[PDB]
Amino acid sequence: MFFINILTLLVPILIAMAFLTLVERKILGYMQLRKGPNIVGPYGILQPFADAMKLFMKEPMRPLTTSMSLFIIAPTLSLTLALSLWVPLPMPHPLINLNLGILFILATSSLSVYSILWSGWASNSKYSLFGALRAVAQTISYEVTMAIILLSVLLMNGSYSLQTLITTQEHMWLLLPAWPMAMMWFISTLAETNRAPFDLTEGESELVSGFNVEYAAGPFALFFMAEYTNIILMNALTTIIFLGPLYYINLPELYSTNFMMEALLLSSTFLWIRASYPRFRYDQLMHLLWKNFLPLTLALCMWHISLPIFTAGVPPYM
Amino acid sequence: SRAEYVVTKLDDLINWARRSSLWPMTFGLACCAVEMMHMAAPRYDMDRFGVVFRASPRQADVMIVAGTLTNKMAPALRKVYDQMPEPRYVVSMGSCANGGGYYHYSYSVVRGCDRIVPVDIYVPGCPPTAEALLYGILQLQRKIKREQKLKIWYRR
Amino acid sequence: GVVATVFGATGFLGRYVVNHLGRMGSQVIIPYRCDVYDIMHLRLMGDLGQLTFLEWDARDKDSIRKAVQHSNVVINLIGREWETRNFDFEDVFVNIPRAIAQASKEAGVERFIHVSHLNASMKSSSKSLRSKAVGEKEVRSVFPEAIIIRPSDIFGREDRFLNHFANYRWFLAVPLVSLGFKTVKQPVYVADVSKGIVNATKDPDAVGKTFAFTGPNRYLLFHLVKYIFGMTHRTFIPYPLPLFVYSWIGKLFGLSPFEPWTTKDKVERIHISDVMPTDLPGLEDLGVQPTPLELKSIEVLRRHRTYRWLSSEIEETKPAKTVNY
Amino acid sequence: TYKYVNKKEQESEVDMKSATDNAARILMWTELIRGLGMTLSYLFREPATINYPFEKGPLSPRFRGEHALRRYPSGEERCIACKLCEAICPAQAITIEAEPRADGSRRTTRYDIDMTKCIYCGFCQEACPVDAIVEGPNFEFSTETHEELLYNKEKLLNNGDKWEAEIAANIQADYLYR
Amino acid sequence: MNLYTVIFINILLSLTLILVAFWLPQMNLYSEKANPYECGFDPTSSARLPFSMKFFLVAITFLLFDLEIALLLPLPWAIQTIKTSTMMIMAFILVTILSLGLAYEWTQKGLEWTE
Amino acid sequence: KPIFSRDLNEAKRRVRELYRAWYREVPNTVHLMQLDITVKQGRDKVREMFMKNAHVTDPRVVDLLVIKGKMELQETIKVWKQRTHVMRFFHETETPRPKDFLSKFYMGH
Amino acid sequence: SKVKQDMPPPGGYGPIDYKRNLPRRGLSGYSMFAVGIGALIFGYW
Numbered sequence A: 001m002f003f004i005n006i007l008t009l010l011v012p013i014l015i016a017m018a019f020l021t022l023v024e025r026k027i028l029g030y031m032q033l034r035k036g037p038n039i040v041g042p043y044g045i046l047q048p049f050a051d052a053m054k055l056f057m058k059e060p061m062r063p064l065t066t067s068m069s070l071f072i073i074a075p076t077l078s079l080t081l082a083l084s085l086w087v088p089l090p091m092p093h094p095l096i097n098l099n100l101g102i103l104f105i106l107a108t109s110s111l112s113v114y115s116i117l118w119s120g121w122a123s124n125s126k127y128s129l130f131g132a133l134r135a136v137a138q139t140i141s142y143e144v145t146m147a148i149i150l151l152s153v154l155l156m157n158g159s160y161s162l163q164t165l166i167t168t169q170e171h172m173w174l175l176l177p178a179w180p181m182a183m184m185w186f187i188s189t190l191a192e193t194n195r196a197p198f199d200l201t202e203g204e205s206e207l208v209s210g211f212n213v214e215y216a217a218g219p220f221a222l223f224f225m226a227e228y229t230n231i232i233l234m235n236a237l238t239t240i241i242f243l244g245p246l247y248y249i250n251l252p253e254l255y256s257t258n259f260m261m262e263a264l265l266l267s268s269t270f271l272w273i274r275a276s277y278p279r280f281r282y283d284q285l286m287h288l289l290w291k292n293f294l295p296l297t298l299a300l301c302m303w304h305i306s307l308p309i310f311t312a313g314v315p316p317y318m
Numbered sequence B: 001s002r003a004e005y006v007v008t009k010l011d012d013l014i015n016w017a018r019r020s021s022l023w024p025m026t027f028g029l030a031c032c033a034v035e036m037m038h039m040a041a042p043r044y045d046m047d048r049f050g051v052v053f054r055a056s057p058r059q060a061d062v063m064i065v066a067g068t069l070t071n072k073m074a075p076a077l078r079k080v081y082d083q084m085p086e087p088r089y090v091v092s093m094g095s096c097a098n099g100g101g102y103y104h105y106s107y108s109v110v111r112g113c114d115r116i117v118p119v120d121i122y123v124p125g126c127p128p129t130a131e132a133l134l135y136g137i138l139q140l141q142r143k144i145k146r147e148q149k150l151k152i153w154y155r156r
Numbered sequence C: 001g002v003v004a005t006v007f008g009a010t011g012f013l014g015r016y017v018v019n020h021l022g023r024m025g026s027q028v029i030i031p032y033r034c035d036v037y038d039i040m041h042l043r044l045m046g047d048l049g050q051l052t053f054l055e056w057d058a059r060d061k062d063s064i065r066k067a068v069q070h071s072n073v074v075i076n077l078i079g080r081e082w083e084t085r086n087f088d089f090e091d092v093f094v095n096i097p098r099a100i101a102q103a104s105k106e107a108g109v110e111r112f113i114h115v116s117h118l119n120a121s122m123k124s125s126s127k128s129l130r131s132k133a134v135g136e137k138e139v140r141s142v143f144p145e146a147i148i149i150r151p152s153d154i155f156g157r158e159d160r161f162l163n164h165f166a167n168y169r170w171f172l173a174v175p176l177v178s179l180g181f182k183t184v185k186q187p188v189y190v191a192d193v194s195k196g197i198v199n200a201t202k203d204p205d206a207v208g209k210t211f212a213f214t215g216p217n218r219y220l221l222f223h224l225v226k227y228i229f230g231m232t233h234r235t236f237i238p239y240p241l242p243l244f245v246y247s248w249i250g251k252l253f254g255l256s257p258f259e260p261w262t263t264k265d266k267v268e269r270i271h272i273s274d275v276m277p278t279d280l281p282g283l284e285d286l287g288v289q290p291t292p293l294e295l296k297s298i299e300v301l302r303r304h305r306t307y308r309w310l311s312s313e314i315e316e317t318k319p320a321k322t323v324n325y
Numbered sequence D: 001t002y003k004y005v006n007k008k009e010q011e012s013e014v015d016m017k018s019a020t021d022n023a024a025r026i027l028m029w030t031e032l033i034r035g036l037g038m039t040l041s042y043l044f045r046e047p048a049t050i051n052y053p054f055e056k057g058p059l060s061p062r063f064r065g066e067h068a069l070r071r072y073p074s075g076e077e078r079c080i081a082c083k084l085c086e087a088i089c090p091a092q093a094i095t096i097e098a099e100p101r102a103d104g105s106r107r108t109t110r111y112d113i114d115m116t117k118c119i120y121c122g123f124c125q126e127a128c129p130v131d132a133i134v135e136g137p138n139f140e141f142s143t144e145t146h147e148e149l150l151y152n153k154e155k156l157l158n159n160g161d162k163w164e165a166e167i168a169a170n171i172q173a174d175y176l177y178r
Numbered sequence E: 001m002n003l004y005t006v007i008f009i010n011i012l013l014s015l016t017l018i019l020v021a022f023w024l025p026q027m028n029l030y031s032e033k034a035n036p037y038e039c040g041f042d043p044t045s046s047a048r049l050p051f052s053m054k055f056f057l058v059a060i061t062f063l064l065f066d067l068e069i070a071l072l073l074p075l076p077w078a079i080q081t082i083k084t085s086t087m088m089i090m091a092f093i094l095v096t097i098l099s100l101g102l103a104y105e106w107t108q109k110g111l112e113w114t115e
Numbered sequence F: 001k002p003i004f005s006r007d008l009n010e011a012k013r014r015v016r017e018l019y020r021a022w023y024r025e026v027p028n029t030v031h032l033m034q035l036d037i038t039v040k041q042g043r044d045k046v047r048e049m050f051m052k053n054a055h056v057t058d059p060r061v062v063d064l065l066v067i068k069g070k071m072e073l074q075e076t077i078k079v080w081k082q083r084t085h086v087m088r089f090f091h092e093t094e095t096p097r098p099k100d101f102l103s104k105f106y107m108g109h
Numbered sequence G: 001s002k003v004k005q006d007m008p009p010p011g012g013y014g015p016i017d018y019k020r021n022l023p024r025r026g027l028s029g030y031s032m033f034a035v036g037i038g039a040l041i042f043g044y045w
């Protein structure tokens, strides 16, 4: 039965990513005044499956200059962590209730960068090394402030467990008390998922392709599935932390539906941003995060250390 | 009905995948790349047919030779064609690429990209209309539809 | 003014034959059964109208007649290293060559060039070689002036020889019968064989004869495999293994529905020692100066190396020891 | 006459209201939201893409497409082996050999155009004195082989017979401009 | 157990995808295809050559800031204390020390990339 | 009038310096570009190309030849010239035609 | 028959707008920050 739950979690997530690719292409097309896919099946709903079959049936590459072990581990690790991060998410009940679910999320997402690093370094290609080092810089930029943002908002939740956010936001979104932190969290997630305007680890205009320039067929498909699974996961995490959906002990499905609607809206906002803005420069990203987010992030962290004490609103433990 | 029938249906699925998703390599040499850009543009929108560009040759299927191939460029064109993983197809758009075009009798032009790589489709024109290139892509899709690799394997 | 029908163009040697014919400027007819995608590499081997691709089937003799209709020369390169579910060694090396030869004779082709094998003997331990001898006899019966070419092992980029041996790295150690010794190999270069066939397409003296295309040097299998692994800077761990166990391993590997990695007949032919020239003409008769393996092994073996050894000079490997038997 | 696209305006406009407006712009991402609003506006417009195979773009009577050789209404061919077409072709795609026909007429025995060598310029059809060689409105004549793109006299005449109505209509519409 | 099971299942799904990707397609291998990529021209040098880092100082600063996060993370449990005055003083002092370090690096031009 | 070298002796000094440079660079070229030739073959080719111009006697022409050879040397030192461009010095696609009168009579005119 | 040739209409065409128009936002700044602070204080309470 736990296996049935594993399936009912994983398979819908994979299908959601598969059709998020199509939704991205169509939203971009319409915002750009074109239609997007609409031949491959009704309105193009078979496009993701066509692409997956084509990619997995295309010949896979074993370049002579690569280190095969890391070259092949990196995509596997990418997809593994992409899927694993979904495990502790409450919706409203997690598949795996963890006391430190948020730290689990942080550690797993941080480890996920090593997929890009090792793939780029094992490609033994100059553009791949460029992409790997840009991933290094991006991680340095955003990881420092993401943790402090999470701590600042968790000083109101009272614990690291994700499931406690549902009862913290039982009467009001955490966005309202901490919308300034919500904005920086949103930008940090945008940078973490390697998405535009921070789409630098794979920057077609500057690097033909970034880390995954020597990757063809199935390994490339693994990378591109991990990316969109992470996009959906991060938007869901925002939806749960801030934008707390409705929870009634007798109506778990209402929480499920509200969460799905809000996460869908936020993912569509990701695609909207990608269609709107131009790209950053991988030094400008670090300068932004270190000269406009870190100062204000520290200020708000100390503000939220003070707030419970001087309002006598210290959260309960357990 | 028969294992032959099952194999034919499987190969039809194979070709459906390949022809529905074919990713041309971001590659353009001269004027004709402008008409390729216009076929990308909203009015025709290649993406509607599932044809999206990719910069890396490792993540491309069809190479659209769009413009004059010179002697200084031919080795690089062959290298990117080779580095494309199989299966891979070639559409030579424009007169420069079909044959020699205006510069056929020049000391620095390869008289036809088919002298360097085996071409799958030829699109006449100087430049061909964006609709003409789209027609060429459709013809390539029909070619992919009539493949029967698995049926050949089973008979073999 | 040559019009040549190449019946095995879509192969390891057929591509070289077609390439050299196109360079000579003679019209070429390629009868194919594979997918159209598999002939794209031949597509660019000839100028406009020089090459004519037509579909054919070994069963249907109308296709064979159509292929050999307007041809002055018919080169037969048909072959296969394993027995297909539909085609076996007997069919591949006797029935199809005989049918092609008879169709060519009826049409009226001036020259017929059949490719067999150096060790093709009626008493050979190998099923393929035993069938090849019968194929030679039947071809020379139904087309009495047909030229016969008997190459030794052919090595090239797309070969099943140097590549086959270098692929033993996937199995850690190299099993050999008698540890390689008591086995003499004389590999020839694919370009040399193709040049020989093309030249025989016009050499006046070649009609009705039998040639033996063999490389310049003869190596013991042990020294040859040692040289191959030295070129592909891999660890050579040879060890002996009796032929019956080797044949069982080949039987196991020959059960794949696709292209087997190895087979009973493949190991048999690997381990049967090449013969000596013995009064047969050879390449120098047709004017091809055989190219030693030492010069052209790098272009075949450089892709089997790891990054460390990718950029190593041809002179960094000790040349094998050539016997004089 | 000139204008400054980007010229400094002032470096002393200080009042609380301006400072706070600039701070709000920086901290609230006003122009970024404006760009998002523009894209959102575009999302709700009718896309300009056309259903190409079943809906083609406009084309003028002067569109230079696939070549064709025309006939007189009586079925006679207009070509009289001028070789002005051949002489003017900038890309040297035309190759003509003519003989005095059995009628005693000046007619071509072979007329080949290398469509992989032609730059589709129309100089041939504007130099032809009898409107014999034309560029019809066909733009969909791609092939799977190179040799199919070497047109001969029979191919060109078949194209002319196939598109005669449309070619004649285009010439009727445009000839007064010529 | 419910976590080991799901993690192992994810690993096995990824590994099965890799196995299918490598053992399904028809493969044609040669040196020209398997060579490294660089815009159609052969690389002029190995990719293993030193690749200068212009933000090394910011990286070694990020290490210390990450340890600062380590020190700051126990705050949810810390605020549950009866010595709230001491906890607040300590948290404020730590955050202000971190801010002073960042400001000093900023002023001394450590956050600027090397050229 | 002198382009560089006043006389044939100075021109020869420049030529010999160029030969030294090419001889030194051949091994690095082979190793870097992964050519399927030997250092002996590369240096033999360098000698053959140098000797192909041994008939020249004008110092100005020798200076031009040395300048163009230096240009090729720079192009090879840097990997601007690729393996396909370097293997053209060997003409391993040419089937030599004979110089025999009767052979020429048989083939063509 | 008098000449019939493409020419502008009698009088001429209507004027063309080419000069940039980019209307400016009406949001003040004080109002934006006031909304932000009000939301913050309400949430804190």
Ligand SMILES: CCCCCCCCCCCCCCCCCC(=O)OC[C@H](COP(=O)(O)OCCN)OC(=O)CCCCCCCCCCCCCCCCC
Pocket (backbone or CB within 6 Å): A180, A181, A182, A183, A184, A186, A187, A197, A238, A242, A273, A277, A288, A292, A293, A296, A303, D026, D027, D028, D029, D032, D033, G036, G037, G040, G041
């Ligand atoms: C009551 C007492 C206590 C009160 C405490 C409260 C005090 C009030 C605090 C107000 C501040 C709110 C927090 C806003 C943080 C913004 C940080 C910032 O200043 O922006 C940095 C950057 C501006 O760029 P720049 O001009 O270079 O700035 C430096 C100039 N030398 O701007 C950027 O970062 C933009 C670059 C990234 C753009 C990404 C695209 C985002 C698109 C819009 C997203 C909209 C949705 C966001 C909501 C998400 C919700 C989950």
Ligand SMILES: NC(=O)C1=CN([C@@H]2O[C@H](COP(=O)(O)OP(=O)(O)OC[C@H]3O[C@@H](n4cnc5c(N)ncnc54)[C@H](OP(=O)(O)O)[C@@H]3O)[C@@H](O)[C@H]2O)C=CC1
Pocket (backbone or CB within 6 Å): C007, C008, C009, C010, C011, C012, C013, C014, C033, C034, C038, C057, C058, C077, C078, C079, C080, C081, C087, C092, C115, C116, C117, C118, C150, C151, C152, C153, C154, C155, C160, C161
């Ligand atoms: N080491 C060597 O390579 C040696 C080769 N030879 C001989 O040279 C000849 C060429 O073999 P090679 O080309 O090197 O290896 P291949 O196996 O590539 O030759 C196979 C050729 O035969 C064709 N073929 C196989 N079965 C059939 C069939 N049933 N009906 C029609 N055509 C068929 C193949 O067409 P497709 O592949 O498209 O089906 C291909 O063109 C063979 O006779 C071989 O024994 C001689 C000495 C040694």
Ligand code: SF4
Pocket (backbone or CB within 6 Å): B030, B031, B032, B033, B066, B067, B068, B093, B094, B095, B096, B097, B101, B102, B125, B126, B127, B128, D119
């Ligand atoms: S074929 Fe014509 S339009 Fe295309 S690049 Fe060549 S000259 Fe330009």
Ligand code: SF4
Pocket (backbone or CB within 6 Å): D078, D079, D080, D081, D082, D083, D084, D085, D086, D127, D128, D129, D130, D131, D132, D133
């Ligand atoms: S095409 Fe026109 S100009 Fe040329 S020969 Fe024919 S009729 Fe005369």
Ligand code: SF4
Pocket (backbone or CB within 6 Å): D088, D089, D090, D091, D092, D093, D094, D113, D117, D118, D119, D120, D121, D122, D123, D124, D125
């Ligand atoms: S359109 Fe121009 S280039 Fe083409 S055949 Fe006519 S004259 Fe020659």
